[PDB]
Amino acid sequence: ACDYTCGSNCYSSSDVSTAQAAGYKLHEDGETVGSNSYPHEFRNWNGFDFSVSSPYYEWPILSSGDVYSGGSPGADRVVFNENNQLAGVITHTGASGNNFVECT
């Protein structure tokens, strides 16, 4: 089925790879997109157990398959570090408030 299920969204590893690459490129270039300036540091207040090293950055992954370019980011995010390693895939869907749950 889905390499990642975020709420009702089904993402393949390639979907995540494409989102990750777009976010990491902005990160390394020191640029951002959208009113909420993505990518930005992901604090991990929820204590997810990521095996790659922090700091972490969150970047929206979109239900449509398009790369985030601004506007509404939806609930899903890919999280990666400065080594361009994927830390995890998370979503506000099914969480309360600004909290997140990991996609399954």
Side-chain angles (χ1 to χ4, degrees):
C2 316
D3 295 334
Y4 300 96
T5 297
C6 296
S8 78
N9 293 319
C10 175
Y11 298 120
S12 65
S13 291
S14 53
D15 288 340
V16 170
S17 320
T18 294
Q20 180 179 331
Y24 184 76
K25 191 188 163 36
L26 290 162
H27 169 66
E28 88 175 302
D29 291 345
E31 324 179 311
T32 66
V33 58
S35 49
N36 293 316
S37 301
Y38 286 101
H40 52 238
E41 196 185 3
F42 174 65
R43 317 299 297 282
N44 195 19
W45 293 115
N46 298 131
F48 297 129
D49 215 65
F50 294 154
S51 49
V52 304
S53 69
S54 67
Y56 306 115
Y57 304 90
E58 63 170 283
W59 171 257
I61 180 161
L62 306 178
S63 68
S64 66
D66 296 337
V67 169
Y68 183 72
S69 66
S72 299
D76 312 330
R77 311 281 180 267
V78 291
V79 181
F80 59 83
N81 69 9
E82 65 157 6
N83 297 329
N84 193 15
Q85 291 175 281
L86 172 67
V89 184
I90 61 179
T91 174
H92 290 300
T93 298
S96 60
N98 288 314
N99 289 302
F100 288 102
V101 291
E102 294 192 84
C103 302
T104 56

